[PDB]
Ligand binder design. Structure first.
Ligand SMILES: CC(C)(O)CNC(=O)C[C@H]1CN(S(=O)(=O)c2ccc(F)cc2)c2ccc(C(O)(C(F)(F)F)C(F)(F)F)cc2S1
Ligand SMILES: CC(C)(O)CNC(=O)C[C@H]1CN(S(=O)(=O)c2ccc(F)cc2)c2ccc(C(O)(C(F)(F)F)C(F)(F)F)cc2S1
Lengths: 286, 283
């Protein structure tokens, strides 16, 4: 169906995925859990909007069958709005370490300069996390099934860009190979801030895009999936728009309530690329 | 009507109840929680019948709910035990404080103070838990903490039957506190030397309770109330004997009791053998 170069490209991405994506969250342990001025007011009013827009309940299923469940608090008008942030900080960081490992194991990425690698990971980390999270998303129950951990959502949610993305991507019933090809397309994005070898990255992305188009023609019937490829490219455009939204969101919260882990500060630009990104450089050279 | 001596007696117990019973459970903190041989066949039969889910409401409105694991079998049946022991110890410390602020109890030799406390701790705890028990939901509403029952099968557990039965009488605060005093001043407890004084004390609290009822409960619903309460107390003594035996069987195959519980229950001269009690009674 596809060429041998195309089959081997997929095989490389699928290997990279099986090796670095802990699908059952079996190594995500020792994480934190929620406990048992005119200019500043404008900041707090905005941050309150950023957080109350997405509400989930936590479910922790014990090995024995015991179930711990965390229902979030209402906006009383204080710090309670930040109860889930250290837990989300640990979850994001775990997910990011997986994504750095994923990129690192790909030859086309490994063969790029360290500075380009850093810039590509800074620009794509969140996007790759969401695509990965989409694979554990249950659209019937409104839940992300993260092994023993579950995140249960509480047309009200269909307005929230992040939620509409998960519901829509899940609707496409994508294959493991298609999710992984979406990951490469997003990772090898030439238009990222700080990318030097723009030409090489553009030729790499186009080859991943061609392989995805070719994979759809060979593996899917006629013609229900006629525009599946273009539907996928639309989702990635939307994903990049949610990424810009999410960076402004995170930075605003970080500004009034510091919560990001050391790796999150590096990825998001919270206070010479190798000098400003020492954790990332270590992780890439391991 | 009530005599001046009876009115003062109620007043004192009521004042002792408020000083020593934190009904909102606001000072209950730093407690353990479940993690995020034919004796085993009997110990499992003790634990299984008393199945509860735990709820924790934060000041913010946030709620942590714990659903327990099923049997077979398996050390998972001992999940709520460290927590239960922390809650018990906290209640027993309030019961100890309750006894201490009572003049009638203070004027007793330290050995009898220990003997009465060892005999009544569980009984007084059960009486105080009944006041926070909601019979409509089967929940002990202990402030931020809630213990919810997971039917004729539920009623097969005497401790659980006692709670529904006692709640049906719809007792006043004065009646609950007089029951505590009657159960505390039990002359028949092991090691009680001052039998006569304790028995005289018990008869005056029982007389005070009878007088309180005649003076305040004239409704047909409350006919025979005094004798029902007295039958409930005898029933509470029976449950207490069964509970001590259940605890000793659980502790033997799975040690969980705090140092105060080991003292109160016997788990291993009176003042030396009960150092913590002796300290608490002096402090
Ligand atoms: C008043 C309250 C209690 O309602 C406030 N809302 C919450 O505490 C919801 C949590 C969960 N979510 S979420 O609902 O958007 C979500 C949950 C699970 C998922 F897998 C994906 C999204 C989330 C996601 C990212 C992020 C972050 O990326 C963000 F803070 F946005 F930067 C983080 F990981 F860095 F923290 C935060 C949250 S907070
Ligand atoms: C398999 C599982 C997990 O279902 C086993 N069941 C439980 O762990 C339920 C607990 C709670 N109860 S209870 O349900 O009877 C109860 C709960 C709240 C109350 F305020 C009163 C009783 C209890 C009571 C005494 C006692 C004890 O007195 C003793 F017995 F043991 C203790 F507190 F010292 F521990 C134990 C329990 S165990």
């Amino acid at each position: 169906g596809l060429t041998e170069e195309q089959r081997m490209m997929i095989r490389e991405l699928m290997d990279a995925q099986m090796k670095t994506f802990d699908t059952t969250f079996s190594h995500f342990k020792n994480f934190r859990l929620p406990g048992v001025s005119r200019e500043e007011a404008a900041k707090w009013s905005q941050v309150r909007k950023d957080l109350c827009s997405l509400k989930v309940s936590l479910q922790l299923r014990g090995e024995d069958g015991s179930v711990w469940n965390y229902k979030p608090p209402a906006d009383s008008g204080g710090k309670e709005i930040f109860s889930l942030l250290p837990h989300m900080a640990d979850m994001s960081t775990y997910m990011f370490k997986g994504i750095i490992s994923f990129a690192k194991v790909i030859s086309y990425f490994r063969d790029l300069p360290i500075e380009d690698q850093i810039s590509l990971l800074k620009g794509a980390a969140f996007e790759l996390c969401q695509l990965r999270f989409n694979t554990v998303f249950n659209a019937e129950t409104g839940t992300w099934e993260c092994g023993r951990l579950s995140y249960c959502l509480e047309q009200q949610l269909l307005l929230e860009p992040m939620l509409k993305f998960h519901y829509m991507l899940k609707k496409l019933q994508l294959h493991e190979e298609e999710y992984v090809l979406m990951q490469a397309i997003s990772l090898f994005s030439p238009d990222r801030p700080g990318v030097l070898q723009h030409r090489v990255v553009d030729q790499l992305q186009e080859q991943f895009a061609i392989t995805l188009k070719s994979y759809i023609e060979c593996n899917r019937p006629q013609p229900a999936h006629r525009f599946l490829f273009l539907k996928i490219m639309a989702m990635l455009t939307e994903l990049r728009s949610i990424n810009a939204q999410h960076t402004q969101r995170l930075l605003r919260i970080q500004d009034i309530h510091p919560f990001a882990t050391p790796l999150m500060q590096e990825l998001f630009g919270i206070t010479s690329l190798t000098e400003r990104h020492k954790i990332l450089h270590r992780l890439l050279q391991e």
